[PDB]
PDB file of N, CA and C and ligand atoms in Angstrom:
ATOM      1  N   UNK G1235     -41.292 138.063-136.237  1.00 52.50           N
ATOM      2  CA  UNK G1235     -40.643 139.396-136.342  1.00 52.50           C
ATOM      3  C   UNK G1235     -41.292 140.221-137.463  1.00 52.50           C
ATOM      4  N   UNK G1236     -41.283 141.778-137.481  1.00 52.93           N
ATOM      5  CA  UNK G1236     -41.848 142.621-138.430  1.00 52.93           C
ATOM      6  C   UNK G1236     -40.522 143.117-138.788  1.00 52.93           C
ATOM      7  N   UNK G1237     -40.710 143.359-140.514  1.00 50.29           N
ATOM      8  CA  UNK G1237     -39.542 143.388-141.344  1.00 50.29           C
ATOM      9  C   UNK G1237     -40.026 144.737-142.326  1.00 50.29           C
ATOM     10  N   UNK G1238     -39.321 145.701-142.537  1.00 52.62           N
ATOM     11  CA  UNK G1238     -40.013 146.678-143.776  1.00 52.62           C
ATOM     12  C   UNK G1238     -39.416 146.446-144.921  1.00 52.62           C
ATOM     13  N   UNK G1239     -40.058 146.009-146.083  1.00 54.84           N
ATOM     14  CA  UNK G1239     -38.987 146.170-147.447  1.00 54.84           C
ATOM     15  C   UNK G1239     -39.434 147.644-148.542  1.00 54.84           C
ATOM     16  N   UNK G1240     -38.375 147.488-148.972  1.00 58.02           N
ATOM     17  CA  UNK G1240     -38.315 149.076-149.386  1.00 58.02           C
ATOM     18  C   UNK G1240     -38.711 148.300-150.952  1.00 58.02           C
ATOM     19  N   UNK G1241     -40.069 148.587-151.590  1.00 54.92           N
ATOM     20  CA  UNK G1241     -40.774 148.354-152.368  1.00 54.92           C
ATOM     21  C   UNK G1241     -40.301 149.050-153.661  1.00 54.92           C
ATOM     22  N   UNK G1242     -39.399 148.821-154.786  1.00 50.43           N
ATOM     23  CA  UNK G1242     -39.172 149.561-155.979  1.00 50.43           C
ATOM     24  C   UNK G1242     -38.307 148.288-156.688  1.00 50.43           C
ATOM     25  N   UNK G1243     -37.873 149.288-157.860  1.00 52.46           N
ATOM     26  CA  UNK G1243     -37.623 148.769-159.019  1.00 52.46           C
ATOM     27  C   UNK G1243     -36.636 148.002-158.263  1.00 52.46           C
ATOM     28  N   UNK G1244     -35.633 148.755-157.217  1.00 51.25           N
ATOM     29  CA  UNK G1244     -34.313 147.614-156.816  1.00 51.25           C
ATOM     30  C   UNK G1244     -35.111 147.460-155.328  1.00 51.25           C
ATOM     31  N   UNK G1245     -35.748 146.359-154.954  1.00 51.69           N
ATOM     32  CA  UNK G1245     -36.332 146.043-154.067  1.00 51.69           C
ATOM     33  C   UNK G1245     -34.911 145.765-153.188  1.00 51.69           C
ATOM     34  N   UNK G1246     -35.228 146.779-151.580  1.00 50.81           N
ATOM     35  CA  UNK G1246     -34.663 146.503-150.530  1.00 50.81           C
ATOM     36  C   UNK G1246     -34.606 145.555-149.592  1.00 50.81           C
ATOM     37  N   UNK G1247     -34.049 145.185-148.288  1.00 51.45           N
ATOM     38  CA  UNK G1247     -34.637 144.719-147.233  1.00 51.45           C
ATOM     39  C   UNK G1247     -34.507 142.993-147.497  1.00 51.45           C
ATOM     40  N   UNK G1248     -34.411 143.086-148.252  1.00 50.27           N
ATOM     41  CA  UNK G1248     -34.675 141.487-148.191  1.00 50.27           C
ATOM     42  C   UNK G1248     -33.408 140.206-148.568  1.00 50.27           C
ATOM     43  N   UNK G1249     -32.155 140.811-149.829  1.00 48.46           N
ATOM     44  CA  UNK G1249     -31.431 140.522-149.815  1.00 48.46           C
ATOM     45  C   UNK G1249     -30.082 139.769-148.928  1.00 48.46           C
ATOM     46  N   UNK G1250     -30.051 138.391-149.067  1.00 48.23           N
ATOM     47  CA  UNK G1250     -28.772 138.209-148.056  1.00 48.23           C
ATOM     48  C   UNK G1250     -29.531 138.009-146.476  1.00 48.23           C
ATOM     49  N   UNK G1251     -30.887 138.148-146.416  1.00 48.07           N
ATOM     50  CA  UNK G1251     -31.292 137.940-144.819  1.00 48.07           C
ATOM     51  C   UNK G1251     -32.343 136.953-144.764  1.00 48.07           C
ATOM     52  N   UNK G1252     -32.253 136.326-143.767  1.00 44.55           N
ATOM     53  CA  UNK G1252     -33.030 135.299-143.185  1.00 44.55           C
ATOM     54  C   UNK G1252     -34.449 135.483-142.462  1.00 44.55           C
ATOM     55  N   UNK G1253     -35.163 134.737-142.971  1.00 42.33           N
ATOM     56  CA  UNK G1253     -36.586 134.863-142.645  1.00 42.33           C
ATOM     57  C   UNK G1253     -37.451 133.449-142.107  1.00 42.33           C
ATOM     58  N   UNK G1254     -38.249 133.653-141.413  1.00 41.41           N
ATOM     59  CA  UNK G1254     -39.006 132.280-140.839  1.00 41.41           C
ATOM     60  C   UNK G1254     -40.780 133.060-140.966  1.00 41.41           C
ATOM     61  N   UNK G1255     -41.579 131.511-140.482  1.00 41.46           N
ATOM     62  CA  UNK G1255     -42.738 131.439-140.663  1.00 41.46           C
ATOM     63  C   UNK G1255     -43.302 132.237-139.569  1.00 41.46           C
ATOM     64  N   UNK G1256     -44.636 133.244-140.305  1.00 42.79           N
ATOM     65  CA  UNK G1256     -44.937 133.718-139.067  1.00 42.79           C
ATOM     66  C   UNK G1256     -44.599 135.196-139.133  1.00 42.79           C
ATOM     67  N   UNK G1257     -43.170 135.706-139.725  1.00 42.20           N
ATOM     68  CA  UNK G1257     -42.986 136.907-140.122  1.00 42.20           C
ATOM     69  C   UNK G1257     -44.002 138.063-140.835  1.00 42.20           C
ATOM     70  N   UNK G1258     -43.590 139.201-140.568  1.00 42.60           N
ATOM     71  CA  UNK G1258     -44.642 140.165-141.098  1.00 42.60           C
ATOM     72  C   UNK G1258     -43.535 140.516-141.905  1.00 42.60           C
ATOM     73  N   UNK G1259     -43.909 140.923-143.426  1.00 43.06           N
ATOM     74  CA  UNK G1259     -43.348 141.901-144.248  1.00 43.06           C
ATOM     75  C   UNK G1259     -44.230 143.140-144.535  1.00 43.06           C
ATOM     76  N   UNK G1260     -43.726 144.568-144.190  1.00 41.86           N
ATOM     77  CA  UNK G1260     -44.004 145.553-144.251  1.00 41.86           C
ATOM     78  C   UNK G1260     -43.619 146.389-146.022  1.00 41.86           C
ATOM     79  N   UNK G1261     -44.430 146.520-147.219  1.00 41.28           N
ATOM     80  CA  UNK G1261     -44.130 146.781-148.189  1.00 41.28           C
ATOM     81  C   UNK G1261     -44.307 147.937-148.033  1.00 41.28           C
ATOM     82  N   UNK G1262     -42.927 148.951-148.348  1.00 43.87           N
ATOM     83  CA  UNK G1262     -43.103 150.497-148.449  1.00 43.87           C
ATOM     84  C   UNK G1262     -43.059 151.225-149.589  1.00 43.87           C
ATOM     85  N   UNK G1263     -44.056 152.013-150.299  1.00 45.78           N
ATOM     86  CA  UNK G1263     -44.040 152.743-151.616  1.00 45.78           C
ATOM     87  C   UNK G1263     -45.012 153.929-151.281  1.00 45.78           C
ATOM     88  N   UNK G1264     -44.783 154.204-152.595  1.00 48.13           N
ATOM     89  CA  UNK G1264     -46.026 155.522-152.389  1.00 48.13           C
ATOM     90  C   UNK G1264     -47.294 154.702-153.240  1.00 48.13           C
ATOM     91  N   UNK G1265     -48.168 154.754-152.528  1.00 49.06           N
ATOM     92  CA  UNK G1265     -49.898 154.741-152.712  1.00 49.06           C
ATOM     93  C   UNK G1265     -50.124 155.093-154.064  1.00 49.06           C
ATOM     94  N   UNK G1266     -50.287 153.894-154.724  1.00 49.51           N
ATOM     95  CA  UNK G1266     -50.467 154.258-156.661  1.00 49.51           C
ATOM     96  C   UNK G1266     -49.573 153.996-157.463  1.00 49.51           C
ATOM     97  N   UNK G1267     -48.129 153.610-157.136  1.00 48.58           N
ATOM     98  CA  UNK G1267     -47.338 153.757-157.730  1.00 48.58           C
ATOM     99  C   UNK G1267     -47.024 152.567-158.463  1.00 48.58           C
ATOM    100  N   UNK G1268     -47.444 151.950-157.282  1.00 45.96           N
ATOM    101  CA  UNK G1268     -46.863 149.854-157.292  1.00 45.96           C
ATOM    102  C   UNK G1268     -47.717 149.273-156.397  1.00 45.96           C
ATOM    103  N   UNK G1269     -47.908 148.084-156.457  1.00 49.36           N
ATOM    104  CA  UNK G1269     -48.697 147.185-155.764  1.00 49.36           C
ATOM    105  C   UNK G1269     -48.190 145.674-155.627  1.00 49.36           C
ATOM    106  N   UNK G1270     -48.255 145.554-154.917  1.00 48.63           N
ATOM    107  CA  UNK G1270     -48.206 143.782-154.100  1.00 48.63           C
ATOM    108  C   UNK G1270     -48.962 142.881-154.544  1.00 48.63           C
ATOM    109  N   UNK G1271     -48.650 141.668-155.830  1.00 49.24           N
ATOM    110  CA  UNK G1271     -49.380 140.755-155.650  1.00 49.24           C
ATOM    111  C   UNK G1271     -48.326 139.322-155.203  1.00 49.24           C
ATOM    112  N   UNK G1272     -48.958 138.795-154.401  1.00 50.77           N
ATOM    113  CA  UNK G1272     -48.489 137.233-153.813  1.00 50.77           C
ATOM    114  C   UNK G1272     -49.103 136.251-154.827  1.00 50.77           C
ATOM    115  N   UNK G1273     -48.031 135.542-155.503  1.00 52.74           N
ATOM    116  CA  UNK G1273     -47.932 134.885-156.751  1.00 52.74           C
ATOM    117  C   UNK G1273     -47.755 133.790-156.433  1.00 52.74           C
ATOM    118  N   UNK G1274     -47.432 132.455-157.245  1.00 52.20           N
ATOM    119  CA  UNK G1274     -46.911 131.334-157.057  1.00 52.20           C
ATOM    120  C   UNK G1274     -45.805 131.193-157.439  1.00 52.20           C
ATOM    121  N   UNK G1275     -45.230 130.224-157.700  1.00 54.00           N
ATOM    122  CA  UNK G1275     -43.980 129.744-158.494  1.00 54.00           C
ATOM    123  C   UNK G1275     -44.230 129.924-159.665  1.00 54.00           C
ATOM    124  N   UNK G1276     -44.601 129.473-160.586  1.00 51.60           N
ATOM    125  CA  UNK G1276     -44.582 129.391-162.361  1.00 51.60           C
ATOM    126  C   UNK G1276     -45.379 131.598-162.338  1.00 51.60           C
ATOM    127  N   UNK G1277     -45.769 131.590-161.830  1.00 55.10           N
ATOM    128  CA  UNK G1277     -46.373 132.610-161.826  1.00 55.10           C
ATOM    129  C   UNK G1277     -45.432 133.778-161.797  1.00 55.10           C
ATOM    130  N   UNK G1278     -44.516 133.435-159.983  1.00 53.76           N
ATOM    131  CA  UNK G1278     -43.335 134.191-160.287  1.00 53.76           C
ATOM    132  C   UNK G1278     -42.093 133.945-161.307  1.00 53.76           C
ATOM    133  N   UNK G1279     -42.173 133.092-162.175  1.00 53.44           N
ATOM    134  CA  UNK G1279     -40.822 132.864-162.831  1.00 53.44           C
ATOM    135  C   UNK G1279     -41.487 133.444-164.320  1.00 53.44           C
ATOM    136  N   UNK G1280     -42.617 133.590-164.585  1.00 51.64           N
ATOM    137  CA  UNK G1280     -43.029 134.293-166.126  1.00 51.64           C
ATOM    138  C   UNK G1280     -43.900 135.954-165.611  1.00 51.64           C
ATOM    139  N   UNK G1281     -43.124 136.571-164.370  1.00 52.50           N
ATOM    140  CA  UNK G1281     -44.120 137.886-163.739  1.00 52.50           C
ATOM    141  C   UNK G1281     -45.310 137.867-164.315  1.00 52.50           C
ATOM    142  N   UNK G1282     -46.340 136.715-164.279  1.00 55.70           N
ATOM    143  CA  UNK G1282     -47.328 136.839-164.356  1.00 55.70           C
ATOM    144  C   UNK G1282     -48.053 136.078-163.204  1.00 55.70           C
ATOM    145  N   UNK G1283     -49.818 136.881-162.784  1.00 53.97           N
ATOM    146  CA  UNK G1283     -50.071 136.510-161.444  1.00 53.97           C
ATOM    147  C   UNK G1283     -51.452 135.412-161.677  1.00 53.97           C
ATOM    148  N   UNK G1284     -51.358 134.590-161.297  1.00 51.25           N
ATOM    149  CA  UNK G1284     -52.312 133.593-161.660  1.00 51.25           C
ATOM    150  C   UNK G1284     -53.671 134.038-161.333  1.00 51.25           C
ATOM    151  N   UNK G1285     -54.711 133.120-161.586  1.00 51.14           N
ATOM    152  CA  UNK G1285     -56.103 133.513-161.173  1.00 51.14           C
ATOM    153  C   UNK G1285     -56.360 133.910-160.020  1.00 51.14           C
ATOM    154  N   UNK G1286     -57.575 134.863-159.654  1.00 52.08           N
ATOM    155  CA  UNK G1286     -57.239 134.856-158.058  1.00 52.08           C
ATOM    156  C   UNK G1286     -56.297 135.447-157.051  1.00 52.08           C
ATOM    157  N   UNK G1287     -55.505 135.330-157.660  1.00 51.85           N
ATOM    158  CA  UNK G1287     -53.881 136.013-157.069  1.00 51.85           C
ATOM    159  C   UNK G1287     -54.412 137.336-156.062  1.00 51.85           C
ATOM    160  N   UNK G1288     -53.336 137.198-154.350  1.00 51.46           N
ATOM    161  CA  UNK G1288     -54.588 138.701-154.460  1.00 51.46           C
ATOM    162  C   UNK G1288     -53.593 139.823-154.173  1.00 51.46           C
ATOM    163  N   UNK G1289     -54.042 140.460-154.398  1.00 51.50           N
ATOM    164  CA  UNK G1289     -53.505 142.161-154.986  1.00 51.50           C
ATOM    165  C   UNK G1289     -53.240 143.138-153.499  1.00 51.50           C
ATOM    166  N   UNK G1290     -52.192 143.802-152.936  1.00 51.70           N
ATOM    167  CA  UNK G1290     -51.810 145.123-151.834  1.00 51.70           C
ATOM    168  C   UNK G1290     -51.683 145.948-152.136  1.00 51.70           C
ATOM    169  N   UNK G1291     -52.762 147.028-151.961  1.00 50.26           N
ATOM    170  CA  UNK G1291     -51.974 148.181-152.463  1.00 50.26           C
ATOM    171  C   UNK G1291     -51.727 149.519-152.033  1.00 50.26           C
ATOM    172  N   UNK G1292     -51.957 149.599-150.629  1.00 51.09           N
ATOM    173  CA  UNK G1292     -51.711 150.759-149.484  1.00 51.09           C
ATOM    174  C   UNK G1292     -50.590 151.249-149.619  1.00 51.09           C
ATOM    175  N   UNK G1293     -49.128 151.208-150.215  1.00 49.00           N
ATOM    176  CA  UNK G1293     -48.045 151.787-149.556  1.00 49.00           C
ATOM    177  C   UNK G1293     -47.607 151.000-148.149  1.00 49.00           C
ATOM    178  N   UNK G1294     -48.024 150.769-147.579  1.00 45.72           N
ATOM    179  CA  UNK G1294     -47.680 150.016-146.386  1.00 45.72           C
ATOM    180  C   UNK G1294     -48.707 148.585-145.768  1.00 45.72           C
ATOM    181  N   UNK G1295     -48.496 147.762-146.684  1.00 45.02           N
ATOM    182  CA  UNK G1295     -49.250 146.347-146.703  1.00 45.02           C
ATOM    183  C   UNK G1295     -48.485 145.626-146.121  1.00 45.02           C
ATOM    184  N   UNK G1296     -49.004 144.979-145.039  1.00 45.20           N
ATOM    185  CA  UNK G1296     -48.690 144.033-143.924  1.00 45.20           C
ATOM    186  C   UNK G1296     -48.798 142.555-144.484  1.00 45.20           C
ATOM    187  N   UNK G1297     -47.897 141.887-144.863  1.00 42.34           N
ATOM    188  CA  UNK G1297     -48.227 140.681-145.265  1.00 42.34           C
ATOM    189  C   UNK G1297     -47.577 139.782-144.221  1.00 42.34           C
ATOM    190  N   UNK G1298     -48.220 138.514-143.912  1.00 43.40           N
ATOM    191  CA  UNK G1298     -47.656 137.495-143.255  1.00 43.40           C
ATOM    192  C   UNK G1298     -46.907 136.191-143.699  1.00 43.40           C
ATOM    193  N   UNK G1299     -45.737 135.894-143.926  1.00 44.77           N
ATOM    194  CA  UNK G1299     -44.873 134.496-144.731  1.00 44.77           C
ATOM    195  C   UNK G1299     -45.659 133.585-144.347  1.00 44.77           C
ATOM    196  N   UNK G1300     -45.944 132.985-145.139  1.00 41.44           N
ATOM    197  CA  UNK G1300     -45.937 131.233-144.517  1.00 41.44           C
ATOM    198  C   UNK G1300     -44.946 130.172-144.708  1.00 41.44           C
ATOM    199  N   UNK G1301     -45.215 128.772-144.336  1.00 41.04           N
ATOM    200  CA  UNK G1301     -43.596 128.321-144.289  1.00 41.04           C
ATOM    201  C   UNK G1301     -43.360 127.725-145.469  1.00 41.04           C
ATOM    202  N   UNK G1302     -42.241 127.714-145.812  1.00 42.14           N
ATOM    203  CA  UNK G1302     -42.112 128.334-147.510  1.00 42.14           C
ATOM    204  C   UNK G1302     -41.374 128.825-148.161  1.00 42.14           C
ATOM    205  N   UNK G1303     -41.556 128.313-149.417  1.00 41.10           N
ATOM    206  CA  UNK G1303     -41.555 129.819-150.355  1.00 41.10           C
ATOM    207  C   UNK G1303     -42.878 130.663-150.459  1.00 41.10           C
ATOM    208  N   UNK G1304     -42.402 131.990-150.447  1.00 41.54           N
ATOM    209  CA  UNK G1304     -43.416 133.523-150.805  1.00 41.54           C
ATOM    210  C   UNK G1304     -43.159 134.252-151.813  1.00 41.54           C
ATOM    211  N   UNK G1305     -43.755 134.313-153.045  1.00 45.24           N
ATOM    212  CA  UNK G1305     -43.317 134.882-153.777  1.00 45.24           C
ATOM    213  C   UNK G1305     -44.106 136.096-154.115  1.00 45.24           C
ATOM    214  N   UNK G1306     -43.411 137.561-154.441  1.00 45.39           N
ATOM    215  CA  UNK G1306     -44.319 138.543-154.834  1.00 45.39           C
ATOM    216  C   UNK G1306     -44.151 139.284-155.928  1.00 45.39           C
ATOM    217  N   UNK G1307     -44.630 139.880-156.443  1.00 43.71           N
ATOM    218  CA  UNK G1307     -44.146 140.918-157.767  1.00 43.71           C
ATOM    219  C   UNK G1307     -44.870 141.969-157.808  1.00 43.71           C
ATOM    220  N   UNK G1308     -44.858 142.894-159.016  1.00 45.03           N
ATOM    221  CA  UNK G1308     -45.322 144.148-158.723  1.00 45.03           C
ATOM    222  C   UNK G1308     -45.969 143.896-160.441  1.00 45.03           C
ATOM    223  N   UNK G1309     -47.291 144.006-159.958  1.00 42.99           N
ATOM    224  CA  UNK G1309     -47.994 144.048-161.866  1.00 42.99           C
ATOM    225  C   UNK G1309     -48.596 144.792-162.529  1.00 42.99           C
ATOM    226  N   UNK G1310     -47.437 145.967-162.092  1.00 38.98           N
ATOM    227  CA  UNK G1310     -47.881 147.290-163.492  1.00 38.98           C
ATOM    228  C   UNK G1310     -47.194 146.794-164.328  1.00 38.98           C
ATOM    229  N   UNK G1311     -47.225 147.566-165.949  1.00 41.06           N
ATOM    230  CA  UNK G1311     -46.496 147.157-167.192  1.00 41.06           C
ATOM    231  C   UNK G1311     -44.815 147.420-166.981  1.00 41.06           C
ATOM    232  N   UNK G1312     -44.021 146.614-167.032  1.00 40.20           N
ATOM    233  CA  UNK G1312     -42.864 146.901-167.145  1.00 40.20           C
ATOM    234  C   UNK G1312     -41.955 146.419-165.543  1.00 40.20           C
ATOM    235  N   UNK G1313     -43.355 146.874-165.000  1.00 40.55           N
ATOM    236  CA  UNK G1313     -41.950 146.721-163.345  1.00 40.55           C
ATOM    237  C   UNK G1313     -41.726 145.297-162.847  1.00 40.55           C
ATOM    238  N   UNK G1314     -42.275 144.429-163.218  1.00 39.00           N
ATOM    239  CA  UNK G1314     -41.865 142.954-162.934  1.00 39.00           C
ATOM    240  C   UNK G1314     -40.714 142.584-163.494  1.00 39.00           C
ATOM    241  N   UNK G1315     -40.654 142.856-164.938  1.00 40.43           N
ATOM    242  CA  UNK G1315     -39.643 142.960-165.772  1.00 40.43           C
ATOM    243  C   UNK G1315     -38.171 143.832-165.652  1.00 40.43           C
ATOM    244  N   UNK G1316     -38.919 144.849-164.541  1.00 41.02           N
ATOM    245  CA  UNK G1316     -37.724 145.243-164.469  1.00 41.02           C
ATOM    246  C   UNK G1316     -37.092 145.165-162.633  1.00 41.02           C
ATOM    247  N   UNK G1317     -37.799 144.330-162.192  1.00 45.40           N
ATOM    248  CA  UNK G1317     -37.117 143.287-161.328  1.00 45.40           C
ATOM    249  C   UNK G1317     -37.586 143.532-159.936  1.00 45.40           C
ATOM    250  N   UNK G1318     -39.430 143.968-160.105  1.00 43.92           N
ATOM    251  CA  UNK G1318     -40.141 144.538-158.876  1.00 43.92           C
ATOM    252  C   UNK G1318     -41.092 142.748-159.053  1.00 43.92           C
ATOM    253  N   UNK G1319     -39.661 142.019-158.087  1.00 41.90           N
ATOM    254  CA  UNK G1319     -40.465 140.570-157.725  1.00 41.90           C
ATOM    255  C   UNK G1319     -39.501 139.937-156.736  1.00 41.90           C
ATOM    256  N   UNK G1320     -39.837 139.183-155.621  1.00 40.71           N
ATOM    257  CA  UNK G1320     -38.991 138.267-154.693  1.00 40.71           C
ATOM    258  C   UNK G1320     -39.506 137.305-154.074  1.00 40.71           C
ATOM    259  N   UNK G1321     -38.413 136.396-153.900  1.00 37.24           N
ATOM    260  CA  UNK G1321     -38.845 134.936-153.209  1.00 37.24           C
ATOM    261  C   UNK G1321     -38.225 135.279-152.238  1.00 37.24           C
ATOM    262  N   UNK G1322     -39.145 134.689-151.128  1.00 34.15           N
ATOM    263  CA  UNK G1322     -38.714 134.544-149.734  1.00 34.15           C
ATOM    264  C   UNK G1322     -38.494 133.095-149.142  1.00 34.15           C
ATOM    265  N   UNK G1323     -37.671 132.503-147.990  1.00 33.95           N
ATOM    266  CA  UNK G1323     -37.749 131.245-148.017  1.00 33.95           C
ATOM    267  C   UNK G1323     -37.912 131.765-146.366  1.00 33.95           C
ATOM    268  N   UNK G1324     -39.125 131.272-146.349  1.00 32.47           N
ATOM    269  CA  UNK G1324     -39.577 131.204-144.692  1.00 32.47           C
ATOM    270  C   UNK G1324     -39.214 129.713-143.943  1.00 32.47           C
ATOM    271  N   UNK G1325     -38.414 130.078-143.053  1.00 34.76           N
ATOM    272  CA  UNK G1325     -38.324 128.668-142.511  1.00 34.76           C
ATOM    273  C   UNK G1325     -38.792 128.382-141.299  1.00 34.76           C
TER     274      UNK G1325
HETATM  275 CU1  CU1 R2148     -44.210 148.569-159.441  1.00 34.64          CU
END
């Protein structure tokens, strides 16, 4: 299934709903503002993105879950911190 999450400081879309492997997440922002990186665990629990880590940053980045946890954050100064990050549990 394709899913849109509403990409900001109070990240939408994703709360309270169920997700499996295989899913598309659709990240929506404006172009420049914020960006998508897919993190790990220790990575997502200190909003910092490990080596490598790789980076979305269209406004509308198509990402695919795998089965899992997915974790993402947003790594301008401040917005991780201020709670532009989520785990997904793909089943
Ligand atoms: Cu951001």
């Amino acid at each position: 299934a394709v899913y849109n999450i509403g990409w900001s400081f109070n990240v939408n879309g994703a709360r309270g709903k169920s997700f499996r492997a295989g899913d598309v997440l659709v990240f929506k922002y404006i172009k420049g503002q914020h960006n998508v990186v897919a993190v790990n665990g220790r990575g997502y629990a200190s909003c910092s993105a490990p080596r490598g880590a790789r980076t979305y940053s269209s406004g509308q980045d198509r990402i695919k879950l795998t089965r899992g946890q997915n974790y993402f954050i947003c790594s301008f100064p401040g917005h991780c911190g201020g709670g532009m990050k989520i785990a997904i549990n793909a089943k």
